[PDB]
Amino acid sequence: EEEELTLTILRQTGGLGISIAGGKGSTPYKGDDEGIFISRVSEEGPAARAGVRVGDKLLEVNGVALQGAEHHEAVEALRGAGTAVQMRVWRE
Amino acid sequence: YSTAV
DSSP states (O other): OOEEEEEEEEOSSSOOSEEEEEOBTSOOSBTTBOSEEEEEEOTTSHHHHTTOOTTOEEEEETTEEOTTOBHHHHHHHHHTSOSEEEEEEEEO | OEEEO
16 A cells, blocks of 8 residues: 555644654654654644645655755745645655 | 654
8 A cells, every 4th residue: 555645735824733753864754764754643733634644754845855855954844835735745 | 853833
């Protein structure tokens, strides 16, 4: 079971309702992948309603790939991604 | 580590 999903998180203000872990140069979410992963989804928050799932690997934010991104770079991308944030994710 | 966004 491997799939790629395009999820659109909608917000008026505030956060997306997720936590991300990992990134280049940080402790990985899993030993075999240094990338950005969803470590927590807020109960029935924006991301939850958009269909995000813990363990999802975040490939892109509004068309900008996070391959090779440091943890802070992914954080900045999600914070400044706007009110409609489309995420290409990898789910197993 | 995690960052809430």
